[PDB]
Amino acid sequence: TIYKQFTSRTLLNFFEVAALTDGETNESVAAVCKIAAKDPAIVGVSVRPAFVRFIRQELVKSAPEVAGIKVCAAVNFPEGTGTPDTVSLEAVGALKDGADEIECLIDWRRMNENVADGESRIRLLVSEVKKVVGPKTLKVVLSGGELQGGDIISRAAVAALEGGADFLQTSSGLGATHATMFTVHLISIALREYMVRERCIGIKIEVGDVHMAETADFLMQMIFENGPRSIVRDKFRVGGGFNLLKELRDCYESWD
Amino acid sequence: TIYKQFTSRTLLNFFEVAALTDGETNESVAAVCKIAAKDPAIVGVSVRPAFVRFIRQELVKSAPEVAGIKVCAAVNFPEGTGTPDTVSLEAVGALKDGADEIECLIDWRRMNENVADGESRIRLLVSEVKKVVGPKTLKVVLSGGELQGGDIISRAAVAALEGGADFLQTSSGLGATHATMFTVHLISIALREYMVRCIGIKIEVGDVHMAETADFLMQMIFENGPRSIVRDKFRVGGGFNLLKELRDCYESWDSV
Numbered sequence: 435t436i437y438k439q440f441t442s443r444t445l446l447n448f449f450e451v452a453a454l455t456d457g458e459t460n461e462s463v464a465a466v467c468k469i470a471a472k473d474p475a476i477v478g479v480s481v482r483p484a485f486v487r488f489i490r491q492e493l494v495k496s497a498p499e500v501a502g503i504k505v506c507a508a509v510n511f512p513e514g515t516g517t518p519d520t521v522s523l524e525a526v527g528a529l530k531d532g533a534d535e536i537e538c539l540i541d542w543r544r545m546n547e548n549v550a551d552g553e554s555r556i557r558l559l560v561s562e563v564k565k566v567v568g569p570k571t572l573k574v575v576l577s578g579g580e581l582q583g584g585d586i587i588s589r590a591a592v593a594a595l596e597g598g599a600d601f602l603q604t605s606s607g608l609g610a611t612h613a614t615m616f617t618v619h620l621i622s623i624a625l626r627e628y629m630v631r632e633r634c635i636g637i638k639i640e641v642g643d644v645h646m647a648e649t650a651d652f653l654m655q656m657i658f659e660n661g662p663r664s665i666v667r668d669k670f671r672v673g674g675g676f677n678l679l680k681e682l683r684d685c686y687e688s689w690d
Numbered sequence: 691t692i693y694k695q696f697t698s699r700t701l702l703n704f705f706e707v708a709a710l711t712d713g714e715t716n717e718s719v720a721a722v723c724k725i726a727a728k729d730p731a732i733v734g735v736s737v738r739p740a741f742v743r744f745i746r747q748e749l750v751k752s753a754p755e756v757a758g759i760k761v762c763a764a765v766n767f768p769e770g771t772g773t774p775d776t777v778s779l780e781a782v783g784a785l786k787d788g789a790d791e792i793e794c795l796i797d798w799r800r801m802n803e804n805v806a807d808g809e810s811r812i813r814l815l816v817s818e819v820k821k822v823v824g825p826k827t828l829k830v831v832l833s834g835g836e837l838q839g840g841d842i843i844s845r846a847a848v849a850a851l852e853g854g855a856d857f858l859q860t861s862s863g864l865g866a867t868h869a870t871m872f873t874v875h876l877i878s879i880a881l882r883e884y885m886v887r888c889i890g891i892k893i894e895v896g897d898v899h900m901a902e903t904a905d906f907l908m909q910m911i912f913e914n915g916p917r918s919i920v921r922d923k924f925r926v927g928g929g930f931n932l933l934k935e936l937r938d939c940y941e942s943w944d945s946v
């Protein structure tokens with residue numbers, strides 16, 4: 435239908451595809467980047483810092499179109515257990531290698547031990563990394579390998595904002611835990627309240643391996659919580675998998 | 691479906707409902723305004739100058755939500771037979787009465803008798819009206835419902851731009867014909883070439899249904915880019931029945 439075609443075209447405009455698994459190779463990363471970069475190009479691709487120079491120095495000769503998508507380097511992945519100094523170094527290297535953005539996973543496990551200490555660590559990590567990112571975008575990933583309660587997510591969100599996050603990202607893309615209506619609601623509340631007490635701050639809804647229909651509901655959630663004006667690249671991104679990206683393209687390509 | 695719900699929600703964010711017939715009454719205007727202003731409110735309502743004060747000073751006493759939609763006053767309606775001075779006087783009064791925007795119909799018939807003269811009349815009408823609207827938005831309506839050749843549509847568009855239009859509106863609503871893919875394409879080319887200030891396009895669709903209206907969103911993205919369909923530079927003008935179709939569709943989405 436026209437409605438599915440319009441929804442898929444809109445989703446493509448905000449989409450960021452992940453190529454973050456333990457088993458990625460240059461070949462698997464290249465395949466993902468090629469589909470990301472086909473006109474109309476999506477926003478970007480997320481990879482571990484290892485792959486940035488392959489994409490930016492080598493793949494571009496094979497597939498020049500990849501120059502037209504952003505590369506977002508996933509630092510402190512997959513465990514979130516590095517120190518501010520080491521994660522800052524990862525980010526420095528990623529930016530040198532050609533990354534356009536950084537996504538930084540927090541030490542989410544610390545929130546299970548001592549919330550106050552966990553919040554302190556988030557503020558330090560995020561503020562440290564923001565110093566090396568300069569005016570580029572720093573997305574802070576609030577969840578990793580396990581499901582944590584709403585109160586923890588809310589407190590992680592606030593700490594990340596206080597530390598200087600340019601974007602709050604629901605989830606890493608690894609494991610089984612991704613955005614839910616509940617966590618998108620809590621993250622939206624945290625951001626809304628931070629802006630009232632108060633820069634342009636976004637929300638990235640990372641949906642895992644779900645299909646277009648479920649992804650579309652998150653789009654609707656975002657507009658309901660944060661208004662139509664939030665549906666712009668500086669304030670919104672959708673993170674998903676390769677199969678979801680292929681579904682979106684198949685749908686859009688059916689429009690005459 | 692979620693796809694129809696998202697498309698409906700998107701259209702509500704662009705919508706300007708018409709209540710422009712000579713037969714309108716306080717009662718008919720109130721009915722349209724109530725559906726226009728229901729949360730989430732559409733952009734605005736188009737009325738003749740005679741109903742601006744009614745909406746802004748009186749209706750608001752029983753329907754306070756109406757303060758949250760814009761009132762766009764239709765000047766030189768319904769036939770485009772005024773002079774720059776008579777149309778300026780309508781605009782001045784409408785703005786005094788609380789109008790937020792002005793929608794000015796051109797003397798479209800003049801283009802059929804002599805193109806140069808028709809262009810000259812547009813440029814002087816539009817520039818004179820723009821002087822009184824000041825920083826508020828002036829939309830110039832290029833057609834009153836009669837089918838005119840492509841050369842005419844294109845030249846009327848350029849003359850309206852040179853005259854100072856802030857928006858190009860396809861058609862009046864009270865006319866027998868409305869926006870088509872053909873006219874939107876011509877208007878888009880004219881605006882693109884003129885740009886090589888912020889200028890918008892308003893696609894007035896008459897009494898068509900939601901599906902036909904959706905085709906225009908895809909046309910706009912393809913021809914003018916995804917960034918072209920934002921409220922600041924894009925509007926959809928349509929009837930009360932279309933507004934109700936959109937709102938009914940959106941209200942079927944579960945926000946809980």
Ligand SMILES: [Cl-]
Pocket residue numbers: 660661662663664
């Ligand atoms: Cl908004």
Ligand SMILES: [Cl-]
Pocket residue numbers: 435437438691693694
């Ligand atoms: Cl559908």
Ligand SMILES: [Cl-]
Pocket residue numbers: 474911912915
């Ligand atoms: Cl496109």
Ligand SMILES: [Cl-]
Pocket residue numbers: 662663703919920921922
């Ligand atoms: Cl908007």
